[model samples]
Structures are given as structure tokens and as C-alpha cells.
Target: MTEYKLVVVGACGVGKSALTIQLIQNHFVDEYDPTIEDSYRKQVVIDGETSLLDILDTAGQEEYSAMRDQYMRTGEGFLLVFAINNTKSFEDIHHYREQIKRVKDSEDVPMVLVGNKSDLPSRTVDTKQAQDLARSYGIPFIETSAKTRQGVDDAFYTLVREIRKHK
Candidate 1:
């Protein structure tokens, strides 16, 4: 009963696939992507409870733009992604935040604002900015560095906790 589907939503240039790539390389997932689209089945033990976390890597976010409402429906939780330096991408998530609830008809859906591309310069959005926007959706925030891969695991880690906490 502790299984969840995590949707990775973000802009085209942002690291939706990159984050997933690092996560799999982190060996968090027992196995791992193909079309820029993939699914990773991971065996996770949390709170002494064995559970399954399914990561649905929906890369090519731009091409799938029209169908994203449908995409959002399949997830039990979400990684509401944006690049650290891409202010537009960061700004873009407000729409998805609103849509996720309306599409799923659930408030406090497990989700977060993930800032990727820490390697890039120009900090257009702060964690506080993310924290604020994400707060509107009742979610947390984290930034990931693909070169070193910091928050990738933590984002998913926090996500599963919220999923378990939600209902």
C-alpha cells in the first residue's frame, strides 16, 4: 500500500532527464531511460517500511506541453521542476501547481520546486522564491547540482515522505 508514482515536470532545457540520470547513477533506483522518457523501479526502505517508488521521467516537456494535464493525472506525487538560472522556467511552475490540484482534485498533493542547473550562473530565483511559490501548493523546495548531484536524492526523499503523509 506504500507505493507511489512520481511525476517529473519541468521545462525543456531544465534537467528533468538530467536529474533522473544522476538519481539512477546515485544507485537509488535498483535499475533505470529511453526517448527521453523512462521509468525507474526502486526498492526503498524508509522508517523500517519497505515500499516502492516509481519515477516516471517524462522528458521533452516542451513537446508534451499540450498533453501535460493528462500527464499530471498519472502521478501520485510530483517533482515540480525548474532550472536554477532559468527564471522563466521557475516562473512557469505556477500554472502546473494550479493544474495539478484541479486535474487531480486533491489539495496538499505531494510536490516540490526543484531548482536544477546550479552550474549555471545568474541566480534569478532564490530558494525563498521557490519556497514561496511552492508554499502556495503546500510543498517544499530544494536545489540540485547535476555536477555533484546534491538535492536529487533529497528531493525524491522528501517527496516520498509527503506522499506517505498526505493520505
Candidate 2:
């Protein structure tokens, strides 16, 4: 089995944990406690390859920045997520990318930028803007809704594909 260490990161209330849960378990949690601080591990198989997804659902609080960095050091791929309803969260992509670069000690790691909460109509972040940002950062982008399972599977599988193709 080929194992892959993946990290999901974003600012607070941007649905990082929700996205991770949805992708790994195919379920969504309502009344989620945003104050929870921890990371979890899960496994998913794609193309008959079992991957050990070491998901670091880091706390969004700035005070937990060092802990988040520790998790990033172990990740081989990244899922940089933000809420579609929060423009400020989306704007934090640059900081997330910079942090990953600093912690991973490489700019070439495969990454996917995710715009979560796609089921909501009150979106503040536009898809075009997300796409442009991903392009600028040389990462793929997907709009996902953990509540409705929209683009959730694709968001994960696409990054897995990208990582597998990376030479």
C-alpha cells in the first residue's frame, strides 16, 4: 500500500475539519464545535492504492500556528481550504501557502486549494478568484460542499492524482 500524508488547512470557521470528515467518512456533522483542537488519521483508497491520509485538522486560532507548522512538516501533499462564504478566509490562501513552503522546506509539493461551503448561496469568494489564485500559486482549485457532498470526493481524488503524477 502506498501511503500519503495529507494536510488540510485554513483560517477558523472555514470548514477544514468538515471537509476532512466528509472526504474520509462520507458524512457531515452539524453543530460542530469550532473550538476543538486536534488532528486525526484516516485511510482512503484510489486506483486500488491504499493511502494513509494523515489529516492535520489544525486549529484556526493564530496561537496554534506553531502546532500547525509541526503537522505541516509531515505532510507530503496539501489541501488548502477556505469557505466560499468568507472572502477573508479565501484571502488567507497566500499565508497558508507561505507557511507550507516554510515548514515543508520545498515549494514543489503538490497542493489543491479548496473553496468549501459551496452549497451556500451567500458566497463571498468567487470561483474565478479562487481559480486565479490557484493558478498564481500553481495549484488546482475546487469548490466543495461537505454538507451536500458536492465536489468533496473530487477535491480529494484530484489531489491524490496530482501527487501520483508528480515526478
Candidate 3:
């Protein structure tokens, strides 16, 4: 079967696992507990082609920093995720993005800028600001809520298409 390797990268508490859980399990998580790198597989049809999605919900904790390069080297595409309400998480996206570029040894890697936790109205980062950042990176940006399922599928599917386009 055809396979797509995808990774979700972000700082802690930015709903990386929650968004991936919604995509795989078709449900949302309400808890605030941390993740220690989880791998999930889902066989689905995207744009009429059936393929296996090997998604890695990476560890957000600083203790797992040493493990990032391994996944980054293998990932074909990535979801550069951040929370709308968390300013620090938003700022951290640049580091992850640059790291991915360095590890992949390519400037044109497939990636999608994701603004998670969009359900929260007290957003510190404006949508336009996020949009501008994504535009600067020359990648697509999407706002999503793992709880309400808004743009959850689109986020992943967008990354898939980005990978498709890169080749």
C-alpha cells in the first residue's frame, strides 16, 4: 500500500496530540496530560486515492528533545502546529520549522502551518498574523479546533497535498 509519513511538531500544550487524535480516533481529548511520542496509522482515501498515513504525534516535552531529529529525518511532511491562545507556542514554530529544514537538508519541504485550539475566543495571536507567517513560509495555513473538529481533516489533508505537490 502507498504510505505517507507525517509528523506533528509544536511546543508543549498546543494540542498536537488532540488534533492527531481527532484525525485518527474521530474524537477529541479534553485532558491536559502530556504526550511522550505516539505513532498512529490510518488507511484512508484522499482525493480518491487510498493510502496509509503514518502519523507521529511527537513529544512536546523538552526531555524528549534528543528524539526529534530521528523523526524529522524520516518524515515526508509535517504539521507545524501552534495554539491560538498560547503566544509562546506560536513563537516556537519558527524554531521547529527551521530545524525541520536543517534536518531534511531542503528548503522546499512540505509543511502546513496549523493554528490549533481555534475554539478559544481569547486568542492572543491574530488570524492575520498567523496567516502572514504561513505566507512568509510559502505554505498553507489552517485554523482548527480538535474539540469541535473544525478544519481537523483539512489540516492533515492539506499536508498530504503539499507532499504530493512537492514531487
Which numbered prediction scores highest in TM-score against the true structure? 3
Q: Which pairs of residues collide in candidate 3?
A: none
User: Ranking by lDDT, best first?
Assistant: 3, 2, 1
Compare candidates 2 and 3 on lDDT and give the better one: 3
For residue 137, model 3's alpha carbon misses the true position, in angstroms, by 0.5
Ranking the candidates on TM-score from highest down gives: 3, 2, 1
Candidate 3 residue-pair clash tally:
0
**Local accuracy of candidate 2 as per-residue lDDT tens digits, 24-91:** 77799775788775666767788888776666666655653676578668887888989999988988
Least accurate 10 contiguous residues by lDDT in model 3: 60-69
The lDDT of model 1 is 0.76
* lDDT of residue 132 for candidate 3: 97
Q: What is the C-alpha RMSD of each candidate to the true structure, in Å?
A: 3.9, 2.1, 1.8
Query: Global lDDT of each model?
Result: 0.76, 0.81, 0.90
* TM, every model: 0.82, 0.88, 0.93
Model 3's TM-score against the true structure: 0.93
For candidate 3, give the lDDT: 0.90
Model 3: per-residue Cα lDDT over 33-122, one tens digit each:
684678899988889988899999987545435456766799999999999999999999999998899888999999999999899989
Candidate 2 residue runs with Cα over 4 Å from true position:
63-68
